[PDB]
């Protein structure tokens, strides 16, 4: 299954108001290609910046055998 | 393919293939000869099958070729026949692979969105695939036709 | 995001000063152009699908990309390209209505270039598709707002490239 | 701004802005002139407003300047007046934007612990905001004051 | 050894004060005082 | 009952906590315990708390 | 949630009717009341925290035991929670005043109030007493202010009272 | 309702209504008079609007009413006109409420699935609503025609 | 869930015996019926949308349910009814393949009556719709597999009641 | 059931205090409306059956509901439908006399939805019938008392919703 | 079984079974006679298989029946034979079902924890299963012996 | 992943041509070798633990890595090494069954080299361990099946290198 290796930082927007424990907003992730669009859109809407992304698993332009 | 689906299931369970899964893989391997025969028949009769399918679709639904239809003109008819050929090749690929996974991942996922973008009648495309299935069943052996009918019905249902 | 009207306020906050005539002139200009921008956004929202269809027909259909061996060949990849173009149109509309390209820079160009590079997406094909979108939207909206929308479309193309 | 709010809602719903949102944007665009007038009057007559507000607050709360207070040093007194000026500038920004968001993101969110870390009493600062709003409303015209007052009241709400 | 007999041993009784009127009946307390 | 396959990835950091949860919930182990034995509505309600 | 306009629309759609003269009349009444609704909402927003603080400072004198031992606001923690509930009541009452309908009140306030308060052991009588105290303060302040129309303000608080109040009779 | 949207947005942040939301509410209340005028004209003209839109649609798209079309037959044509009447009523609801929420809630959720089940061309339905838009806009001033065009275009977009 | 094989296996195991002749005869019967079950499942998967469409047209459309005030008035509510019919048809096919109405019991019936009672859904009318689905499926699949499908459809109806 | 007076007295009793000025204001408002309420109630009581006849003629007669296959077809079900309309009119009169819908919640809309669902009663048809009753009563009683009665009739209809 | 597994996967994906699953189910159903026959063979030889396997296991491992062993004592030895019969029955169930799911659900989940609480050596249990597999293979033809040994080795590997 | 059939179909679809003899010969070869691959996979599944144990004993045990201060000193590290080894064996069996190395390249060698470099696992010693595993599996399944499995094992070794 083709998957993306993404490096992104997503600083919180409601930590001050909610008073919750901090988490490292910078992370490297192996995200499925199916969920990658939703994950990237959520990251952009959250306000964080994705610094690096790549297709870790899979061959570019593959027509069959995605799964 | 059935083999890749079984491998995916075994990996998801984090285990080797069960005896039943291995037996199913062996059965698919044995039936691969008949699957290849059906694929050979379809690829050999690619031109005539698409020709009769397109003619039957045109007779059934003349509004496509009528003025105002999406497939109006020689170029539109050529595009429609090209789509016919693409889907028949996908059906052959699925029959060879033993499962509709290649068909779904090549020309069956997002088909509704693509036809909505292009204005094509999805029902018309489904009827065209049904005509292709009818002509293929008439042209090939009943057992091979029965085996390919499952894939054709899957494609037409997904396009429905 | 970051609106054009909010841009002057943000700059004034950064320099710790109040909005001046040198910036309130731009504020008044945005206020004057607000009606035109609102109408352009309404028109684009009404005719969202048709613009994408026309641009695809004028740019990508009957091309190497849509032909087998191209990145837009398979049905899933064609649907992905259509979704990308639709999102481009929607975010260009958002940028036009807001009067700035900050939303395009943030919510569009965050990692799109490297995602396309990893996926092997054709940069030139994307540029041509965005140009077709620009031409279609300019025709549908008029030159007055067509140039304004093409500004943000050129911004998107430059960011992608 | 209201434009930002509308576009954010549209993006959250994954849709273009609706008719009501567009008409609200139109209304804000119409009222931008009165927004500009608010900004001009406030920015060009802050000094009398800020002086009156500071004197009235220190008369009402004779503790910070008095022994055991918070404004012993001239530096502390200057800091209090600078906070007055910054809050009023933020109020001008918010009125021009047409929504709470500039004030909220500049000097509203986290302000309570902001001044807890500095030992400035939150009720004291909310009283300061009340007196500053009273001075600005008295110095503005009736419709102008009615337009500007809810922003100051919202800031008072957030403070306490 | 038998020091551990907390729940096992004899229960340690507590004292419960019967509920009495509070300031909710201050007016009636004053009424009783004047009727004294 | 466990999935060492996903455990190793979470341990070395290949997939962080969010993707671990996403894979585990759709794993057959959870599908046999909180989706298969339930109506869709009850399964959704349980999935919220999970 | 549904405001007055939306509830009227839903009512007419139930029968599948077009908006008739009575619908236009009710809409006109709400739209003319909207000015006073916005005015009252602005005033309550201006004096919100003071209103709740004064309402508590009257309610704990009306029923003093809520701060004495065995009372439900005994700790500062309990006191702050009680004031938070009072602030919630005021905010949702303001929302209901602007919306001219109590369904926004119901969906977000009353639909489980007795269950939650019984589970926490909170009294269900003193809370409505404080609600009515807030309503009295709000209407007195509105009458003092230049509010031509103020009758609608008692509707949300009274609906809260009727819903969350035990059926004595 | 715009009031509904503003109250919900404020409640999501758990604060009292912001001055911007109050301004939006006041603008909506002020424009309520024009809203009732537009809605009243639409409801009074509902018969002629529906009839003229149906005539235009049945002239532009004879396929839907020709034999083999979904609306073919007297009863089917009456049902198509009844659907047009439903959507005109929904447009009046949206006009009164100042937004498209009633239209979405009543007649724009799952409409694609419903009409696919019924076998109707959703593009034909959108064309019918578009013609209703044109006919209704012919019956009012420039401003009110543009105001109702928002609801009409929203229905068109949701149907296509 | 449980198919015929797992059902007989569990029945033997709970009392702790091996598989005797009687159980083996049941498994032989299931294996005999497996081909028909697979053919019926393929046919129903091909005609899933058409079956629900015809059933709705034959039972529910133009009744009191779709008219204003009915439980199928809003388009969302109509789509919900269609989705419920889709569930019923798909799970009937599942139970027909498995030869056991256990997936129906543990994934369609346990609490569904409570949900419809809360939502006001008319159980009698949904039973009528399921009967129409049964009739259409029988007409499209044949008497032998139609009866088997109708067995589980009636099981769902009885569970609902 | 709680009328306006009992509602005021309950609101005062749950707070433990005496009827202050607001309570007297509410009581006198209800008493002022009492003359109109009593007039409307007496007129409806006198013309009870005629109103039901007019509503049935306007809504259900000569329709598929009353034709064979309709829930109002058999004579027993026609009599039951008439009795239900009598219930709605009498309980609307009760709610008009009491100034409250509490009786409607306690006695009328209490289990009615699933009662009709189990019985197979057409909810939309009964809603339209109640609307016809409302309009006939409004015509027979006047605009003001007609609207007052229509308040409770629409409450019943929305409860059926 | 394969039917249950495929139906579960289809349900989880909220879809009908694909033809690639339907044909696998058809092949599994068709090839049931051999599985049944192996079932009757094992069930007929259950007593002899259990006795011979236990004898060989105890000869190979004396500590199990030695003083201090888990199976030391009359009742302990009889219970170990009972466990062997349990696992033989589970293997027969799996052979008949053409899958290892019945074995795993019945007597394979938590086996490690159960035998650890009992003090029994799971490795010795696996050795007993291995001896049972050897005896069954001896009593079965070459193909049938391999097919049954598939389930036997699955059980042995899961045990250890 | 891509098996032999999927890889062939993808290669055909890259040029968008039908299945010819140039790839149908490969399909025939795969279908012929399927039975041998299945038998080898069955043997590996039956003796998975034994093969790994023998390879570890003959390649890793009594070495510096197992000595304290080595990469396999702790019991947890030993368990991790065994888990890595039987992961390699199972995925090599998967690759052999599929006829292609895509499964190994995507689900095994995604970041294994970098992970081992970061952790400090001796890559060379892992290479000798995999060679021992290959020898054991070849001597336990057959010459042809042994070579078939060794192809994927050497592919994994090259990926590690
Ligand atoms: C203060 C000394 C400096 C400073 C602070 C500052 N930090 C942020 C944002 C974040 N800081 C953190 C904190 C952590 N991340 C971790 O991983 C850990 C341990 C687990 C900690 C403590 C995080 C997570 C963020 C992102 C937002 C969030 O709360 O999650 C900012 C905000 C920057 C912005 O503009 O968005 C600031 C200002 N700033 C200075 O100038 C000081 C030098
Ligand atoms: C014929 C049965 C139907 C029909 C055909 C038709 N198609 C087009 C245009 C295109 N068709 C496709 C489809 C595919 N391309 C792929 O690679 C795949 C999978 C292999 C599919 C399904 C595409 C991408 C196009 C765009 C043009 C292009 O390929 O470059 C047309 C032209 C429409 C127009 O207006 O230009 C037509 C007419 N039309 C019918 O009515 C039949 C139901
Ligand atoms: C169309 C004009 C061009 C084109 C498109 C294309 N894109 C993809 C796949 C993806 N595209 C994106 C893009 C975005 N995600 C976002 O959040 C944003 C903001 C709107 C953008 C622009 C993503 C994330 C994907 C991944 C999809 C997924 O499900 O993971 C494809 C498919 C690639 C593939 O390998 O299948 C295609 C074809 N292709 C062209 O040739 C045009 C130039
Ligand atoms: C054994 C031949 C060698 C060895 C092994 C060893 N590995 C680790 C730790 C990890 N190994 C992996 C590798 C994988 N995990 C996976 O899921 C897969 C793909 C499916 C692989 C290849 C990982 C991820 C780790 C990290 C920890 C984890 O549990 O996942 C260790 C211990 C490392 C530690 O720091 O504790 C050891 C000892 N050691 C040798 O000496 C051999 C050469
Ligand atoms: C001032 C010199 C002294 C004083 C007076 C005072 N208190 C109140 C009100 C309250 N005081 C409390 C006390 C407590 N809450 C706790 O949790 C604890 C336990 C450590 C304590 C001691 C509370 C609950 C209240 C509120 C209820 C009430 O009215 O009593 C007032 C009245 C304020 C007002 O009217 O708004 C006054 C005048 N408190 C001190 O601590 C000083 C010794
Ligand atoms: C104050 C007038 C009375 C009082 C209050 C009190 N309440 C609690 C705890 C809770 N109150 C609520 C209520 C609500 N939550 C909501 O979301 C809504 C509508 C928005 C309401 C009305 C809830 C849910 C709780 C518990 C959860 C929470 O607070 O987050 C307490 C705490 C009691 C304790 O011992 O902890 C108190 C004291 N107490 C009185 O005596 C007054 C009559
Ligand atoms: C006319 C522009 C198009 C058209 C219409 C058409 N519709 C039907 C049948 C139905 N239409 C609806 C739709 C709704 N009911 C609702 O309550 C709502 C929201 C208020 C909607 C949108 C329904 C439910 C039906 C089913 C029948 C019923 O009303 O009970 C038909 C007849 C279909 C048939 O075969 O019976 C037709 C013809 N057809 C076109 O071609 C136009 C594009
Ligand atoms: C004729 C001998 C007498 C007569 C008849 C008359 N009837 C009606 C109206 C209705 N009659 C019925 C009766 C039934 N419907 C049933 O389903 C059955 C049970 C099998 C019966 C007995 C009904 C329901 C109606 C209502 C109208 C409708 O059918 O939809 C009328 C018309 C009344 C009017 O004013 O509308 C008449 C004239 N009248 C006589 O004088 C004769 C004694
Ligand atoms: C003695 C009480 C038991 C016993 C011992 C035994 N062990 C081995 C071989 C090894 N033992 C270990 C264990 C560890 N090595 C470590 O570094 C640690 C970390 C705390 C442990 C627990 C290892 C790794 C080996 C492999 C050889 C090596 O050390 O390099 C043997 C020999 C096995 C063989 O096949 O040669 C034996 C005999 N045996 C018993 O029966 C006792 C119960």
TrEMBL record, chain E:
It comes from the Bacteria. This is Sll1873 protein. The lineage of its organism: Bacteria, Bacillati, Cyanobacteriota, Cyanophyceae, Synechococcales.
């Amino acid at each position: 299954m083709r998957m993306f290796r993404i490096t992104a930082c997503v600083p919180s927007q409601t930590r001050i108001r909610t008073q919750r424990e901090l988490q490292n907003t910078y992370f490297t992730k192996l995200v499925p290609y199916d969920n990658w669009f939703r994950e990237q859109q959520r990251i952009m809407k959250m306000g964080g910046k994705i610094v690096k992304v790549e297709l870790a698993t899979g061959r570019p332009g593959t027509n069959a055998g995605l799964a | 393919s059935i083999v890749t689906k079984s491998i995916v299931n075994a990996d998801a369970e984090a285990r080797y293939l069960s005896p039943g899964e291995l037996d199913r893989i062996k059965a698919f391997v044995t039936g691969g000869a008949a699957r290849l025969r059906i694929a050979e028949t379809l690829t050999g009769s690619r031109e005539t099958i698409v020709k009769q399918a397109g003619d039957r679709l045109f007779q059934k639904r003349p509004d496509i070729v009528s003025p105002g239809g999406n497939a109006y003109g020689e170029e539109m008819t050529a595009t429609c026949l090209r789509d016919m050929d693409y889907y028949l090749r996908l059906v052959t690929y699925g029959v060879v692979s033993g499962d509709v996974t290649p068909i779904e991942e090549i020309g069956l996922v997002g088909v509704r969105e693509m036809y909505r973008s292009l204005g094509t009648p999805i029902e018309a495309v489904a009827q065209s695939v049904r005509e292709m299935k009818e002509v293929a069943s008439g042209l090939m052996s009943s057992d091979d036709a029965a085996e390919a009918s499952a894939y054709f019905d899957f494609v037409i249902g997904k396009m429905s | 995001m970051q609106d054009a009207i909010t841009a002057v306020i943000n700059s004034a906050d950064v320099q710790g000063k109040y909005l001046d005539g040198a910036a309130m002139d731009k504020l008044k200009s945005y206020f004057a152009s607000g009606e035109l921008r609102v109408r352009a956004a309404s028109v684009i929202s009404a005719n969202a699908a048709t613009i994408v269809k026309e641009a695809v027909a004028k740019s990508l259909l009957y091309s190497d990309v849509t032909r087998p061996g191209g990145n837009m060949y398979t049905t899933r990849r064609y649907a992905a390209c259509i979704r990308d173009l639709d999102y481009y149109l929607r975010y260009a509309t958002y940028a036009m209505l807001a009067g700035d390209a900050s939303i395009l820079d943030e919510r569009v160009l965050n990692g799109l270039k490297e995602t396309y590079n990893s996926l092997g997406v054709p940069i030139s094909s994307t540029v041509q598709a965005i140009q077709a979108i620009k031409e279609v939207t300019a025709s549908l909206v008029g030159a007055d707002a067509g140039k304004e929308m093409g500004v943000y479309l050129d911004y998107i193309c430059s960011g992608l490239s | 701004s209201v434009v930002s709010q509308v576009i954010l809602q549209a993006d959250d719903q994954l849709r273009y802005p609706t008719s009501g949102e567009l008409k609200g944007i139109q209304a804000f665009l119409t009222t931008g002139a009165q927004r500009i007038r608010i900004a001009e009057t406030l920015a060009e007559n802050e000094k009398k407003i800020v002086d009156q507000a500071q004197k009235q607050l220190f008369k009402k709360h004779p503790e910070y300047r008095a022994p055991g207070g918070n404004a012993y040093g001239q530096r502390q007194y200057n800091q209090c007046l600078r906070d007055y000026g910054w809050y009023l500038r933020l109020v001008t920004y918010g009125v021009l934007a047409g929504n709470k968001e500039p004030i909220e993101t500049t000097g509203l969110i986290g302000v309570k612990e902001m001044y807890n870390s500095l030992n400035v009493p939150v009720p004291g600062m909310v009283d300061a905001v009340t007196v500053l709003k009273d001075a600005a409303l008295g110095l503005l015209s009736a419709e102008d004051a009615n337009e500007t007052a809810p922003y100051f009241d919202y800031i008072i709400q957030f403070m306490s | 050894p038998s020091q551990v007999a907390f729940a096992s041993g004899d229960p340690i009784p507590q004292n419960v004060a019967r509920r009495t009127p509070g300031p909710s009946l201050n007016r009636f307390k004053e009424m009783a005082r004047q009727v004294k | 009952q466990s999935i060492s396959y996903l455990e190793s990835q979470v341990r070395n950091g290949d997939i962080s906590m969010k993707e671990f949860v996403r894979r585990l919930a759709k794993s057959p182990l959870y599908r046999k315990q909180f989706f298969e034995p339930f109506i869709n509505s009850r399964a959704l309600e349980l999935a919220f708390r999970h | 949630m549904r405001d007055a306009v939306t509830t009227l629309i839903k009512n007419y759609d139930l029968t599948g009717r077009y908006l008739d003269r009575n619908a236009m009349d009710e809409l006109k009444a709400y739209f003319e009341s909207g000015s006073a609704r916005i005015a009252a909402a602005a005033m309550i927003n201006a004096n919100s925290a003071t209103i709740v603080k004064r309402a508590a400072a009257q309610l704990f004198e009306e029923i003093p035991e809520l701060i004495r031992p065995s009372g439900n606001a005994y700790t500062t923690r309990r006191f702050s929670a009680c004031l938070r509930d009072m602030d919630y009541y005021l905010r949702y009452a303001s929302y209901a005043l602007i919306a001219a309908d109590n369904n926004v009140l119901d969906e977000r306030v009353l639909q489980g109030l007795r269950e939650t308060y019984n589970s926490l052991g909170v009294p269900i009588g003193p809370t409505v007493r404080g609600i009515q105290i807030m309503k009295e303060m709000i209407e007195a302040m509105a009458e003092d202010s230049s509010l031509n129309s103020t009758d609608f303000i008692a509707s949300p608080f009274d609906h809260m009272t009727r819903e969350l109040s035990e059926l004595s009779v």
